RNA sequence: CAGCCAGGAUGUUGGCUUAGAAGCAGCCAUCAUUUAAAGAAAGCGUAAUAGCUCACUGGUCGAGUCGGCCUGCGCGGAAGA
């Protein structure tokens, strides 16, 4: 690893955008695929482009950094691998069961999609999102 | 060093005998006594063991490191059994298994008897291939290693015994 | 897209009829033949044009026959055709080769039928000209 | 300017195994007048040498001269140890072979001249331009030192 | 054995033992005769075919080759003694250049053949042998003759009694997965053995003789198209020619053209290889009918102006590998060496 | 830092010399945009193909790691009747 530069301006970047965050899910690819890789963030491009981020930096000192400035409750992702895929537009989109539907799609493992915490729920399937 | 420090778990089943340096982990598949340099210690807790070199010896943590390490190679062979696969290749390479000793038809004028050791077993699934059972990692790399020294593969067409884990290069 | 299913592409063009010199029998020897060039895989480059190569995958695991499906052309195969001179690169980078206009593989990229990586059109719009100014080209965007 | 080219034909001692050139100054004799021998600081010469066919103990070869002093190409043949067959002056001691014939050591003594002999010759024309080209036919005394030299290989060696 | 490479060495000959100048004393006696003797005759190099090596890969790996330079003369009158003679194993077939208007210096056509390349240099003199009574104090003596140096392009070329050539990927290497012993590699795409894998067929006892593989080129007088001259180079010694030339490519333009130019190449390499006896054959049979194949056959004779048999032979279907292996055997009894 | 479990893809078979070289025979302007953590890329096995890999990142282990400088004492260099 380089310098300490860029490590704090990346999380700054993450914590900048809760603010206008929306609904997010889960995945945990352990053993993932470029092809699908291609999948489910060529969606993610579909809909707008470049500004949806996926990165993947749930360490015990990383991502939990920024859990106390917002979304306090997320702090138990201390456990092993987890996924972000946060929507600036929109309410609760369609993004958020897309895991789900692609869990058997070649993606057996995908965090058991345990989802976000906008109001403080458990982990479930959520299919009554605005469309 | 960094070895030594980190804790090690023994399973369920296998006991561990301490009669001051002599251990005894005699478990579900066999039994084995070990021995030490006479510098370390080894110690019995709940449920891990913790080894610590003595003040006055130079070397310390280097041979502590390699305390635990023997006894992982000794912890699992009593609980999971050791297998190693050895390969023959070749027009006229007979190998087979009678009681306990190989025989095997390597080109020689006389076929070759190999007599294995009482805590390693020999076994042949099919007539071109043989599996090697045992207890310590000690003895069953020189028995596969014994073997090979018989037929050590050439460079040109890798004819002879080898291990399946190596592959052995063409030139 | 899903193992490795011993997948192979190589090809010189679409206008010809599978010359040996060129490529020669080398389009499969693990159970693909050469008499079925003509019969599927000519059954929809024939219906539009034959004036651009086409890499293709495979997909043979235990049939006689295959069940691929043909994907879009390099992006530097029309650079002959549709874009200037065709002798090839000769001098790599002692002088200015050739001049590329903004206009120039614009329109045509997008008519890739099976080949995206998301919807921002701007991404592949300067993306396409990556392929570009490998030989001793010149943007002019 | 050297751009006159001549030929030499010569018969020597000893089996040959590859041309070459060689290149040594030469001077006169420290103690002979009649000898005309290889001198570190005498005048610089080069000559060149190939070879056609070998023989017994013998050679038969062709070479090109540049310079045409005086004794030019018997010093640089003989300075490589490799003296002429018959010289005189500058070739070595006479040795005849092992299992030598009656007839061959006759040739020797019969052969009493130096063996050297020049065929072709090329030249420009004066006013016009245009190379000649001319050869010399062997002459018969190294026509018949070649046949016994080919004769006495041909059954001893064989 | 499964590259063929050619290369060239550097050889030089020991100079012969130097004269030593010495004048004995004795333990009570201070004046004494001139003590010393000769030199060591300086070792030479001959060149020896071997059967065991075949290819020129140590000389690639030893660029040069000192022979043993004769021993100085020493007291008590003593002469050195003789270097010895490095000899150096070469395939049989090999044939050696030089430079400054350098020619071969010999054919090796059987084992056994010694080739005297290098002549080391001989002996000098001591002052023993400069004895006389007017000198009485002989302080002279002769260096002795410096050695011979050349460089030699060692060019290795087959014993190939029976040589063929052949169209690309026509089952040239398909042809010796006949009878013939050797196992050349063997696939559809052009150009599949570079190696020249050169085999044997044994019909009987008391007659054999010898064929090699050397691959298909296109017209290119430089070092294009992959291959060229550099494999033409093994021919030469081939007392029959075989020219294979394929029927109904799968996917190769028809010989038209294409196999009337191979033979005017043949032209220009460097003498049209003398104008051998060559012999016109076919493959690729089995694929279409065995009638069918037979008007089609001769009709290319004429076109390329081809008036022998022009025999048909299935190379990898094995029909009629025989009968031309009959017909060219006669043809070699019939025509020795001479 | 090194390990273990995975990623190594993309426009893309990169243009001439090219039969065949398409990261691994010959030239680099060394492209950059896609999700980002990964290069038209240092090594096997051939002719590429297809596969093994690496720098890099993600997860786990959890506390030192990396190689330059000066110096004391050491090792090989050091075989004879
Ligand atoms: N059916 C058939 N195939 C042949 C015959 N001769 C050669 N082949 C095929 O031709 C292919 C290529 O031959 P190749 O060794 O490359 O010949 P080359 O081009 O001269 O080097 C081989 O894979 C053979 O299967 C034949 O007589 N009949
Ligand atoms: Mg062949």
Redesign the pocket.
């Known amino acids: 690893?380089?310098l300490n530069l860029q490590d704090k301006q990346?999380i700054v970047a993450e914590v900048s955008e809760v603010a206008k965050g929306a609904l997010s899910a889960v995945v945990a690819?352990?053993?993932?695929?470029?092809?699908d890789?291609?999948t489910e963030?060529?969606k993610?491009?579909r809909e707008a482009?470049?500004?949806?981020?996926?990165?993947?930096?749930?360490?015990?000192?990383?991502?939990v950094e920024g859990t106390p400035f917002e979304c306090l409750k997320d702090a138990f992702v201390?456990?092993?691998?987890?996924?972000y895929s946060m929507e600036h537009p929109g309410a609760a989109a369609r993004l958020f069961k897309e895991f789900a539907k692609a869990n058997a799609k070649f993606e057996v493992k995908a965090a058991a999609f345990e989802g976000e915490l906008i109001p403080a729920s458990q982990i479930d399937r959520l299919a009554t999102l605005p469309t | 060093?960094?070895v030594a420090?980190?804790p090690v778990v023994v399973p369920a089943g296998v006991d561990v005998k301490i009669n001051g340096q002599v251990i005894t982990i005699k478990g579900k598949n066999g039994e084995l006594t070990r021995t030490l340099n006479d510098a370390v210690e080894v110690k019995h807790a709940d449920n891990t063991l913790t080894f610590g070199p003595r003040d006055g010896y130079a070397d310390g943590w280097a041979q502590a490191g390699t305390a635990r390490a023997l006894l992982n190679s000794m912890v699992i062979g009593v609980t999971e059994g050791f297998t190693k696969k050895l390969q023959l290749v070749g027009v006229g390479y007979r190998a087979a298994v009678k009681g306990n000793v190989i025989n095997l038809s390597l080109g020689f004028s006389h076929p070759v008897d190999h007599q294995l050791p009482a805590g390693i077993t020999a076994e042949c699934p099919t007539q071109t291939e043989i599996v090697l059972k045992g207890a310590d990692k000690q003895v069953i790399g020189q028995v596969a290693a014994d073997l090979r020294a018989y037929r050590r593969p050439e460079p040109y067409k890798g004819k002879g015994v080898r291990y399946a884990d190596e592959?052995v290069?063409?030139? | 897209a899903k193992?490795?299913?011993?997948?192979?592409?190589?090809?010189?063009?679409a206008g010809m009829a599978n010359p040996s010199?060129?490529?020669?029998p080398?389009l499969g020897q693990q159970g693909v033949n050469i008499m079925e060039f003509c019969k599927a895989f000519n059954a929809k480059t024939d219906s539009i044009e034959k004036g651009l190569?086409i890499?293709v995958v495979?997909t043979v695991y235990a049939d006689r026959s295959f069940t691929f499906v043909t994907?879009?052309?390099?992006?530097?195969?029309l650079?002959?055709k549709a874009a200037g001179i065709?002798?090839?690169?000769?001098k790599?980078?002692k002088d200015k080769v050739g001049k590329i206009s903004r206009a120039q593989l614009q329109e045509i990229?997008q008519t890739?039928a099976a080949?995206?990586?998301?919807?921002?059109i701007?991404?592949?719009t300067?993306?396409?000209?990556?392929?570009?100014?490998?030989?001793?080209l010149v943007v002019e965007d | 300017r050297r751009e006159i080219t001549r030929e030499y034909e010569a018969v020597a001692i000893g089996h040959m195994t590859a041309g070459g050139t060689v290149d040594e100054p030469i001077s006169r004799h420290p103690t002979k007048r009649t000898h005309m021998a290889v001198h570190p600081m005498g005048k610089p010469a080069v000559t060149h040498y190939r070879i056609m066919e070998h023989f017994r103990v013998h050679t038969r070869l062709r070479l090109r001269l540049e310079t045409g002093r005086t004794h030019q190409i018997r010093v640089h043949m003989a300075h490589i140890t490799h003296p002429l067959v018959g010289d005189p002056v500058y070739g070595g001691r006479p040795r005849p072979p092992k299992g030598a014939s009656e007839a061959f050591i006759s040739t020797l003594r019969k052969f009493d001249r130096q063996a050297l002999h020049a065929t072709m010759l090329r030249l420009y024309h004066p006013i016009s331009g245009i190379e000649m080209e001319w050869h010399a036919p062997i002459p018969q005394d190294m026509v018949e030192l070649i046949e016994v030299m080919r004769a006495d290989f041909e059954e001893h060696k064989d | 054995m499964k590259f063929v490479d050619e290369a060239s060495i550097l050889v030089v000959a020991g100079d012969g033992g130097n004269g030593c100048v010495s004048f004995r004393r004795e333990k009570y006696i201070p004046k004494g005769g001139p003590d010393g003797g000769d030199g060591g005759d300086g070792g030479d190099v001959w060149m020896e075919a071997d059967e065991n090596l075949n290819t020129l890969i140590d000389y690639r790996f030893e660029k040069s080759f000192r022979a043993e330079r004769g021993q100085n003369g020493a007291s008590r009158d003593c002469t050195g003694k003789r270097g010895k003679d490095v000899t150096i194993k070469v395939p049989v077939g090999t044939r050696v250049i030089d430079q400054g208007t350098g020619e071969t210096m010999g054919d090796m056509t059987k084992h056994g053949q010694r080739l005297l390349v290098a002549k080391g240099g001989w002996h000098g003199l001591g002052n023993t042998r400069f004895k006389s009574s007017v000198n009485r104090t002989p302080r002279q003596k002769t260096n002795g003759t410096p050695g011979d140096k050349r460089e030699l392009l060692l060019e290795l070329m087959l014993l190939a009694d029976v040589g063929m050539l052949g169209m690309?990927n026509a089952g040239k290497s398909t042809f010796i997965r006949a009878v013939s012993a050797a196992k050349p590699k063997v696939?559809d795409?052009?150009?599949?053995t570079?190696v020249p894998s050169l085999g044997v067929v044994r019909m009987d006892n008391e007659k054999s003789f010898v064929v090699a593989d050397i691959p298909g080129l296109?017209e290119?007088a430089?070092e294009?198209?992959?291959?060229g001259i550099r494999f033409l180079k093994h021919l030469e010694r081939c007392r029959v020619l075989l020219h294979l030339i394929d029927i109904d490519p799968i996917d190769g333009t028809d010989p038209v053209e294409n196999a009337r130019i191979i033979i005017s190449e043949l032209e220009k390499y460097s003498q049209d290889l003398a104008t051998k006896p060559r012999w016109l054959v076919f493959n690729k049979i089995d694929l279409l009918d065995k009638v069918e194949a037979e008007e089609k056959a001769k009709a290319i004779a004429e076109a390329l102006g081809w008036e022998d048999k022009y025999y048909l032979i299935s190379a990898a279907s094995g029909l009629g590998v025989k009968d031309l292996c009959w017909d060219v055997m006669t043809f070699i009894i019939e025509n020795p060496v001479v």
């Open positions: 690893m380089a990346a690819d352990s053993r993932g695929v470029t092809v890789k291609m963030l060529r993610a491009g482009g470049v500004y949806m981020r996926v990165v993947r930096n749930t360490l015990l000192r990383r991502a201390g456990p092993t691998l987890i996924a | 060093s960094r420090k980190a592959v290069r063409t030139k | 193992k490795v299913q011993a997948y192979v592409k190589l090809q010189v063009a010199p060129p490529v020669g080398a190569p890499p495979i994907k879009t052309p390099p992006a530097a195969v650079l002959k065709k002798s090839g690169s000769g790599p980078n990229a890739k080949d995206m990586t998301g919807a921002d701007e991404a592949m300067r993306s396409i000209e990556g392929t570009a100014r490998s030989m001793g | 690309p696939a795409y052009p150009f599949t570079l296109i290119g430089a294009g198209a992959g291959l």
